[model samples]
Target chain A: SAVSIPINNAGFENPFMDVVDDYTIDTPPGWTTYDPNNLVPEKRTTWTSNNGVGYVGPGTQFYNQLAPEGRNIGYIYLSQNPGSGVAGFEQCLDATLEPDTKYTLTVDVGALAGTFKGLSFAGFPGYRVELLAGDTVLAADHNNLFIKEGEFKTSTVTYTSTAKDLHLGQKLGIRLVNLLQDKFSGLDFDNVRLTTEPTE
Target chain B: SAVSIPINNAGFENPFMDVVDDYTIDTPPGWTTYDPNNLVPEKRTTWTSNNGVGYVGPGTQFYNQLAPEGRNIGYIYLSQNPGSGVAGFEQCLDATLEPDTKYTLTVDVGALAGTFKGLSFAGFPGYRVELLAGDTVLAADHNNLFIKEGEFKTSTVTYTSTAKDLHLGQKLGIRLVNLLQDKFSGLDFDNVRLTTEPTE
Candidate 1:
């Protein structure tokens, strides 16, 4: 009894709520920019969803904690480009892949000792969580889990389609990787879930 | 009426409370080492009184906000020597310095977007709060005050001794600075107060 799947804004909160300052959203509407070595904006990679507000004001009230999924969070990294920092973001899910059905995907990871508006983010440059069908790669959550600075950690992935498997319907993607690179450190995402259930 | 110059360990908490990890105490006992330039230790300038317990633990729980003074917090910064990162910590007050009185030095500044154990602290690289006597500086809090990340702000300095004021009886000091330079980012100090009032 699950099949909801309304992953649209998931929770980036749109261009910005004007919480004010440090607003760098290279792509945040539906998501897409998982750069695959295309490299160029200094090196490659950069993402933002910052609403935590830091010129000072609004991250709820000065970000001690409260963005588990709302204010805005989708921070990817690698601007000076420093190798390994990787990059991420991906969507494409209209929902298609029947046969036995039972897919679940969740995301909410953050590990920011990140000086935030102060600057040098440096921290938690590792991450990965796929659950595709078209490109085929059912489930993943590579970096494990270790989110806690302001706080947040909920990365799950489940799969079970079977009939033959191999991209059954070909249109159910969901990737996210900044799987590790380094310039200073960064990696935050929020909500972005998916659900389906039948398997019986 | 208020003359309680007992600034010994003030609030650095001494040695450490065994919260465990990243225990870098170059000097936390009574305090000393403002390092004029002595530079050497990658570059010079490093401070830590961290009970934030990281590697993955303490920090009260995951530090969103809770270190106003007692769970320990005294984080000066600058490693790899990087110029400007300056550095500081000073303490010398057996209590002495009178006249008309009115010395009020309080401190509790922190803007750490600092990636923390995640690394790359980067943020709030400016600070100064002196209220010395012998070395002669009485009252200071340069860099103004803009703390707000995890949160913390309370930097007051009064100074109003008379009798022509020439370090009157001497002895009375407490300095802390990370002023600003490079490296990543840092500057945190807590509690440490001083009071003396009799302006008559």
Candidate 2:
């Protein structure tokens, strides 16, 4: 039995547009953004999509970034402070997940390399991709991965939706959070996918 | 190396609504319907979604029936005349197929058994699920299957997109066709799928 979990605009294509602001950014279609300001009013910067140029929002820098799929890719600021407010993207799944259904999530994350205004290429950012049901986190990866600058790596996570008592309802959600708050720390991501079957 | 081909509402779960009429039916979401008249005119009955009680479009009897997934399934009127206009469904894929890329399509189909307003169960419809690029059929299966009444079975076909010259572009398309025009020869289909990798 092959079960499918549809992710709309899985690649940053369709309605192709770019955002280059410092405080806010136009997230890709079928996705939502969560900045520190969105949670609190005083956060400084939000998430940024690669614009093929450097300086994505405040305190963030990108260089020689190319899309893994079509046109654009997404990244978040990483700081050394560890307490810096997090900025990332989220999307409410159109297909409500069934309880106890095991799902596999695969996404590509790369470290921003090359000479940017503030890039030091020191340590890689701690990347976390999660499946959430309301405020409850169903599955998450907080492992501090060490990716080389300008190198993209794949991350795979298998999750079983159980805990009915904690899950609010059937609506499933996806979140990409950057936990490394180190100076000159940033992450590049593309080709995000979620499936209920083994992928080739 | 895994490339994904997306199918919207692959399980007939989107725009989830039911039509109980014997004349016409609303096509499933993300799919297109061809009812003969659209191609020429003066066609008879079109395709219908099984309402769980059988009687797919003006049928009289139904004994064994259940959706392969979710709540509903699709069926076409198979005639014995061998010349009757055919009716079925089609959907344009979101991902444009790459030349030389092999794809596998899997779907579950059943025979209309038991009793019906008009049914003989003599022969299954010359059922075909095709992958088309423009008017050229890159790959197709027109197997003459004999399914027991009300019981569902699976069909699988693997096709490689060659003939780039004949193929207009990448916009891959899918079609569920009933070529048997024999009277009382109908086909029931559910859980239609297409993928680029081997599905388990």
Candidate 3:
């Protein structure tokens, strides 16, 4: 069995961050977003009450599909009316990198199927999932996966650590990146997982 | 009875942000800090498990008192070893300013009484508690209050809105400021409350 590492607020289910807002006013616990513009997370993310995020009845935004993990889902959307660049959500966890361990980070990425305020989903804006140690990015999946509207694709980034790695004892970090800023486009995220094992 | 407007994470006691760490690793839920220095909240704050912060059992940091609210307390300190300018913690609330309503924001500010890791309490740097609507500062208390070691003082900022105010429909906000960064000096805050009434 792969040794599982716990990721706090992995599902964006914290009630403290469950409110719905258009300005991306709140961030999930144990997570920090890199927002240099002071856009307050921009208009790129959305949070709502449990089971209050993505509705998935027939012909819904999700079209009969539910979120991969919990009732709440994180929506990263860019509106045509505003401007934003590459956005990142990262966490520096308490766990440290261990030598001779193979680490893998998995996340479910989705594309919204519905439209709002005369805005409809055009296409995928691309994404990047990364695993880091200290300030160094060890492994990353950069827009290599494809997801259609109303669909979620599981993405993983893997890396193996050795004794000579510079940041061996550094804190482990997870970063979810929105690569391209597209108008009326969206990305839903859920069920983040990290596993470590010997030569696994 | 006066109307009470709830402030999210008003006491900074959410379990989601209760973990203690250096580097100011977390922001309280429903709270946002201005950190243009990419300081990630800078080295100016601290958080610990419930009842695990600012212990005051005689001769201790707090000396003989508990936090003003819950067991947890937020420590805004400027270490002599680091360089940090004025810091601010703010929240854009869900409540809207109503015409002819008198709004009051109250916060408990504290001074630690003891020392740790060769760092001792020097003096009160300064604090500014403010109430705002939209981009305007409606009312503010700027470095006007004083507190002794191991002491907690209740600070308030009041503002009464009018129908002709420029931001009549603007959302309300609260901002806590740390002025005059000092070496080993700190300000502990808690029990943030906002009350309102029709020009009472």
Candidate 4:
């Protein structure tokens, strides 16, 4: 049987925060943040949520030029510092996987026309999406999804679960990573999903 | 995309050993054993492989009057100790489960006729077969299949993998347990198998 997987707040619309000014804020709701308590501002990975028009952040224009669906969008950033670690968000799926099922992940990713102002990072920002069952990685794509300024595109990845891929009692985890290290590389994302179909 | 799971040594024909006498010898190969070194015979559980015809264990009359298929079968024992645990064998499948796929486990089971010799336990022995992914049991059957003096019968159990049972990286484990607690309680089984069919 084919079944759709439900992703919580897939549009990055939760823990709703309005953009009063251009600044990187809190990670979106339903997502786990890495290095949340990091002391150095340059070392902290940050995720910001925005609605295209009135509530844009510092690099929001260069990150999310438009919202794919609804008014909300997700933005990820990596500091240009060589010591800066990749920062992003992760979601623990509410459901487990079934035996012999194939899963597909689909998401919309794009970029803004400029760069994160003040961060001397060069070139476009890079991003990665991963599907995991516990510590086991089911599928991942980090293949330079660098969108041109003012552009958006869709990325898809698929995987088949075998008996050797069983991760009992563990929820699936979706992780988004900011791979660009050029000072401040930013990318916009929306409409994330994971779905399963029977492979009897 | 229906896939068939291959069970290694499903017929109890591996690690072939000669029948030294009327006894349950070393555990069948390619299977895990519990309580193998447990002291106290009454508290110890043992499983043996038998090649029918001239070879029979202490309760052969109650267990294997004949192998349901081929010349071999598996036997399990449970001591009379109320605390005595039942012992048998378990196999970790080479393939994992598929979501939305229907799985069927079929095996031939039979008990020795009459009571276990010298033990106060009466009636026929009972056995249990379980389909599991790690510790999560997907399906199990413990229905008593009391065999006549010299007969055997087939039993099958089926289950469909659900989103509720998503163990993506785990291997399927097939476990057989000797459920009867009477001293010298034993049972016989053969032709174990697991197969899958499309649910759609």
**Backbone clash count for every predicted candidate, in the order shown:** 15, 13, 0, 30
A104-156: candidate 4 lDDT, tens digit per residue: 87887765554445543234445567777775545555432335455667766
Residue A150 displacement in candidate 3 (angstroms): 1.0
Report DockQ per prediction, comma-separated. Answer: 0.01, 0.01, 0.01, 0.01
Over B74-129, each residue of candidate 4 has an lDDT whose tens digit, in order, gives: 76655444334456678888677666567788887765555444543233344567
lDDT of 1 by residue, B24-105 (tens): 5456778775766653253233353111111212554324576676667766655534343355788888888887678888
Residue pairs in steric clash, candidate 3?
A: none
What TM value does model 1 have? 0.23
Position A44, candidate 3: lDDT: 36
The per-residue C-alpha lDDT of model 2 at residue B63 equals 25
> What is the lDDT of every predicted structure here?
0.61, 0.54, 0.61, 0.57
Top-scoring candidate (lDDT): 3
TM-score-sorted candidate list, best first: 3, 4, 2, 1
lDDT of 2 by residue, A97-132 (tens): 565456777777666665545445545545666666
Candidate 1 local Cα displacement, residue A8, angstroms: 6.6
Native A-B interface contacts kept, per candidate: 0.00, 0.00, 0.00, 0.00
* Most TM-score-accurate candidate: 3
Can you write out model 3's per-residue Cα lDDT over B72-103, one digit (the tens) per residue?
55655444323345565788998887877777
Q: List residue ranges in candidate 3 displaced over 4 A.
A: A16-25, A36-64, A80-84, B1-200
lDDT of 2: 0.54
